[PDB]
């Protein structure tokens, strides 16, 4: 229903994380990633597939990626860690 391909991400503090969240539908009425992290967009052709470009990763976050397919609201998260010396 909603797939996030980079599920297991390791990346240090401050860098950028590429998150790819799409749905298993043909018409994503309402789709987005819920996090308070800065992101513009990443260019990707196709009305279904989608990449947000997250940046300035400081702490451990679990963003939720909804998708309003015509069978209810769906849910998919991703798991990301940080690094420190």
């Amino acid at each position: 229903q909603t797939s996030v391909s980079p599920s297991k991400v390791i990346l240090p503090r401050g860098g950028s994380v590429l998150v790819t969240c799409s749905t298993s539908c043909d018409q994503p009425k309402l789709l987005g990633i819920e996090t308070p992290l800065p992101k513009k967009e990443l260019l990707l052709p196709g009305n279904n597939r989608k990449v947000y470009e997250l940046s300035n990763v400081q702490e451990d976050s679990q963003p939720m990626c909804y998708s309003n397919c015509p069978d209810g609201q769906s849910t998919a998260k991703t798991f990301l860690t940080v690094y420190w010396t």
């Binding site: 309003n68 209810g72 609201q73």
Partner: protein, 231 residues
Amino acid sequence: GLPTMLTPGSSQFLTSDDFQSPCALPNFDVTPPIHIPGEVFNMMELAEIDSMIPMNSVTGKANTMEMYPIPLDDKGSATPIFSISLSPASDKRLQYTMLGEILNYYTHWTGSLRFTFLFCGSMMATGKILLSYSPPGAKPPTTRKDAMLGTHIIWDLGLQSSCTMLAPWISNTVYRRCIKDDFTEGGYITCFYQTRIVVPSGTPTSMFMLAFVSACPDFSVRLLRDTNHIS
């Protein structure tokens, strides 16, 4: 004998047709009817009956008889007592009510809803409880200075022990849908301690409250479909 011509749509079996058919039991003297009480003439006679909302369907208390009583106390917090969207066919706590089960056979619905709230505390427990309905398209109300601005009702506790918060038909479309749709979203509903609930000594502090749902007499449905409870 008679010149006829066969149109398209001949020799089809449509599952919603209305045709005649030869009776396989000719001259069957049917059993004469008697006046059985409680005859239903319309499925909207069943929408106008109250039925409890599983409002307390949190992790642990769901799927048991603690799903219905809403927790109350005497502390008088600013937090909402409950909060629920107005989607009586696709919300996780409304689609299993008697109104919610009929709406999952239909697709488009209009009309206003009726929330009758029974207070099941003690006799000496007096209090005031705000009951609010906010139309959609803004911030979901969390504090009391956000839900006072909508359609609300301030309810007092005492002898007459059941209020009625009405959620009116305020909608862009003539017919909202029976799914979680963004364009036909219903509204935001909260419930705040107006002043607080006060108990004396020798009286329980933590109490409960029951929550109902029915349909106003301008409530009507269309477009019969299958449901999504059973398989």
